[PDB]
Design a binder for this molecule. Structure first.
Ligand SMILES: [Mn+2]
Ligand SMILES: [Mn+2]
Ligand SMILES: [Mn+2]
Lengths: 495, 495, 487
């Protein structure tokens, strides 16, 4: 249970010393009235601090210098109520490395056709005000998200909420670390990337340990805790009775505790493992990974820290009741000429946030990583639209491929499927989407989410200055190619 | 009449040692069950050779090192039946320069919802398998067409068979020569190019001979050959009776013998001439040129070796009955407000393969290249959708301008047009499709084709890594103007 | 003790069909006369397999196809006895991914001033022949090493020989694998890199194994073999008497065998460990890594697979008797204004190939080898991942004898003066962003690494005695474009 309400977004209001101290107080008053009314609408999942109205050059850098310092400040929102000369913003936007939202709004909705004097016009210069401020953004190449509309209107409140989550997700990643029990699966390429380029460009701290450091913890678990976890299990899951099924549940319980004590110690947010390197671990970690991920931790099997750190960040976005974000691996295809589906699952680890019903603890024999039959949760995937993403290292940079999909109800049950499953249509056609994915060269290790819109992932790349490529219903393949080889240069040398 | 049944494409399947030794046989059985059913389908104009399951790096390089060696292996198909670590593939794909198709498929259409156990999941890891292997093509920038679908379904088979025809038209381009009889027409630009760059980029070996080398062949022709062809002419064409008309036919026959002896001697695929440099040649080459093209020999006029090499490369694609590729020069227009057509012809040379009626031999005096009145075939053009291609050299690189056309039947006869004619509407509008053609700067010397779709040329430029610019029905004049300046960069520095 | 005399270097000759059928045989016989005496010279450590004189455009590919297909072919030498038009070479050079030498020689030394008819001039069209063949190498941007000189004159023989040693060090890397035990030291950056970008560029397959996988090998070692190494330790090294000292030797013995068996089991050229993951391992690898490095295996500590893969590649270049290459780590500094030295060593692992005297075994528990640094000129190098690309920083140094012994230094030490000044060389090394983990070689000269990087199309930056610092900054920033967007 990791939340994001502790995070605050600094609202920033613009004018200049070269104005009457009466109208500057009229915008201070006016802005206050906006954020007061804003912070009361529960669509926003974090605070909005309203800092003094910025007139001077020095006041710009000041507020920024402090906004970069403060670990609770997950983003900035900038809005010029009156004309703010922007050559005051430069030395402030030079020093600011936090996500930007440009909110292009005007306190009053309608034009007072009988009360629009120079007195008022001077107060509400908002129309031109943050066009001048809009250029200096574009002219500096600063990454930001411009949004136009009255704060009264909800559609704009939606757009800024999508950003807020994404902006706070980024910090829960720059702050966070990725724990790696052992390195990648041997001779695998997609899972692999530049550990250094991730800390430079995403701020993703990432460190590898031995598996023997985890094994020393799993054998050291108080026995009176594991039975106090099995009494919580019975409240949700648990197999018929005690057997060789429930010896695995007591083994995964003493694995779950050993991680959670380890993941706090190293400032972790997303971890990763490997199924061919589980020495001194009496069982493959399975039910222990599904529980941790339920709490919010990012995960990626076969050492894949890209997917792990993506699951984490896209988890942090998917807080709202529409909730639903897992770690997915496209395992098999339905190729029926009209309904070309794709069954999404893994060898074990599917997050129960996308569980349509009560997740069912099951144990089945599996040869992969020759050790005791592990426990796992079984449940039919959630219907309704979703997104499937994947970050992948292109040597010099990263790219984010994202497949908008339409999760369909599971039409036939599966008596011999041990893993929880999901069924979806890769939009538009499965051929066009999955041809585009591979053209782009996404990881096999993908990031499923039922919570979040595609827009979220677009704002995420936009605010980290990396390529993103969207597999929408409006997917021309010939167009997508041209996009791939055009993008390649922009993000390649420039940034 | 060079066919391509001789040409073979290598079917490569990927796994890893880190599996049961007997499931690798299960893949061996299963791949065979595919490529055997595939080769029994006669849409594929070349053979397919299944090679043993690839598990180790060693095997990946050892197959690829051979795939460049065998001159009849004109491309490789690649599909991962299970998860195949791509770092195995790097040294292999690093070394490969034969066109790639990435077949993404699954041996069974539907998922056995009641019999899918972890032993079966392990066997068909085909979904997440060639995503991972997909990434290594994207990250190493390796040019390849990817295709997705089930090897049963005809859509996927369509794509791969249109690639095959293209990949073997590349090998019948690198392998062959271009034989010129004189340089380029004086002061003509789009016909000129770097005959050296061609060989580095396209492999097109190209050289130039004198005209007197041909003159020494036309005078040394046995008189029992010119009359053995005439008896084969009468079987198809021939002008009414013995007259000054049937003297031109006995001059084109010996030119066809000389040309034949030359191009076979030089292992030629295309050739090119010039109407201002034919010294010691009693007559301008024409009916002989049109006869050589009816076999499959490429040709350009005015020295055009760009057009000459395309005609061939697009000829080799068109072997099957739909056949119909020529050598075109957009001659005149019908600027009628509704039905804006274009009349593609030449001073003489147009390939009969596009004829819709019996080619009629005709002789008419023409002032282009001072010498005796040459013989030509006169016929109506073939109706139906066609494409009008032109390569041309932009210093650093080449681009492929392809104007899909809708070839209409000729409404009225022309009792005063000497040369065989064609009438089309350049899609979409004549104005758009031309105003775009001139923008992309297409050669006037094009390669008309009523055999192939745009599909072929796109797979071509894709595989050779050159700029392609299509003139679709979807042609947003401005959008095209943005494509030309964006593509500029990509194909300039990178490639 | 992995050799490179198996490797063959295909000598390619250039003529055209468009010649008298006779003269082509005088090119074949004359080339045969060149390589026959050439192979006879022992300065070349790898064979030379002359291949039929190449006239046709088709023959050029065929040999290059053969040249990429044969694993033991680790280079191609080229020389155009007569004028060989280059547009025959294009389709063949395109398909070639094996290091290239353009030899520019003439079978006769002098010009027979009295006897130089067109019948001879048209046979030794060697000058303008490979002058025309040079352009196409320049035009396509193909990597190759151009040499000039009559085959008899030892100077050119050297220049090609160093290439040979380089090229075969490349092929013992494209074929080889780098075995990591554990990842890099946590939060360390110069060790870290793009594992997949390296296989592409440097051909180095690289994969990691959990440290546990090794421990199962060291515990399963026959105890009656670990003595069979102790018996061979006694033939060269060993500590005074049976003591805890020797339980640290039996524990390094049983680590070396396991490393041997594990680095045999896979076609492994270089390896790497880390000191903060050795769970289930009863000791830190030290002696057992110095022994293996003495044989030829490349090593880097704290996971550094970059320094590891270089040490291997630069160990294969170092084969001849002037041998001496070790995995170095510049530890401390003597700052004395006149004799500005540096005391290179490591936490443990220093290769005994640069040993002046008898290597002594010392246990301080990790077991080391105590020996002085080999004097005279050497080279220090480091490969580092600039994210997009790679760069190889190489610092020429003048290793000096050690003036006073150190009774309380457990690790083997090497003293050297980084050329020109200590200030310049080191300021430059840091500007260029060299790894702390280096490859120290007394065996080879700069020349080797220059022809290595040139051959792999990666930036190299030299710290010569001719090191203008200002000019070096400008040289860093101008290199970063070329190796950036282009390669
Ligand atoms: Mn996986
Ligand atoms: Mn013309
Ligand atoms: Mn170190």
């Amino acid at each position: 249970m990791i939340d994001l309400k502790q995070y605050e977004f600094w609202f920033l209001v613009g004018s200049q010393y070269l104005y009457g101290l009466e109208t500057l107080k009229k915008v201070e008053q006016q802005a206050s009235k906006i954020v007061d009314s804003l912070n009361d609408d529960p669509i926003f999942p974090s605070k909005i601090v309203l800092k003094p109205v910025l007139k001077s050059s020095s006041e710009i850098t000041e507020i920024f210098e402090k906004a970069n310092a403060d670990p609770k400040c997950a983003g900035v929102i900038v809005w010029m109520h009156t004309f703010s000369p922007s050559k005051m913003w430069i030395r402030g936007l030079s020093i600011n490395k936090k996500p930007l939202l440009h909110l292009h709004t005007q306190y009053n909705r309608e034009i007072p056709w009988d009360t629009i004097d120079m007195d008022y016009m001077n107060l509400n210069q908002s129309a031109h005000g943050d066009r001048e401020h809009g250029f200096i953004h574009a002219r500096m190449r600063l990454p930001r998200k411009v949004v136009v509309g009255h704060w009264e209107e909800k559609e704009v409140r939606e757009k800024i909420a999508k950003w807020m989550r994404v902006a706070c997700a980024i910090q829960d990643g720059r702050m966070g670390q990725i724990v790696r029990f052992g390195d990648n699966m041997r001779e695998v390429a997609s899972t692999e990337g530049d550990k250094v380029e991730a800390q430079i460009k995403l701020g993703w701290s990432i460190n590898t340990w031995g598996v023997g450091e985890l094994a020393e913890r799993v054998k050291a678990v108080p026995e009176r805790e594991v039975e106090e976890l099995l009494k919580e299990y019975r409240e949700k899951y648990i197999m018929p009775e005690d057997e060789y099924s429930l010896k695995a549940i007591r083994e995964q319980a003493k694995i779950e505790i050993a991680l959670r004590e380890f993941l706090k110690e190293k400032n972790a947010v997303g971890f990763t493992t490997t199924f061919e390197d589980l020495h001194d671990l009496p069982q493959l970690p399975g039910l222990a990974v599904q529980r941790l991920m339920e709490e919010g931790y990012g995960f990626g099997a076969e050492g894949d820290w890209k997917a792990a750190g993506l699951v984490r960040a896209i988890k942090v976005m998917g807080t709202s009741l529409p909730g639903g974000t897992s770690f997915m691996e496209d395992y098999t295809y339905h190729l029926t000429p009209g309904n070309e589906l794709v069954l999404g699952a893994h060898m074990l680890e599917v997050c129960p946030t996308i569980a349509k019903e009560k997740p069912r603890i099951e144990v089945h024999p599996l040869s992969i990583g020759g050790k005791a039959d592990p426990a796992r949760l079984v449940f039919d995937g959630q219907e309704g639209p979703a997104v499937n993403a994947s970050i992948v290292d292109m040597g010099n940079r990263f790219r984010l491929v994202v497949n908008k999909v339409l999760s369909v109800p599971i039409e036939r049950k599966m008596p011999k499927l041990p893993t929880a499953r999901v069924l979806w249509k890769p939009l538009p056609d499965f051929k066009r989407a999955t041809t585009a994915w591979i053209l782009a060269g996404g990881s096999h290790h993908t990031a499923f989410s039922t919570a979040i819109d595609v827009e979220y992932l677009i704002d995420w790349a936009e605010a980290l200055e990396i390529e993103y490529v969207v597999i929408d219903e409006n997917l021309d393949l010939e167009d997508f190619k041209k996009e791939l080889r055009w993008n390649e240069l922009y993000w390649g040398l420039l940034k």
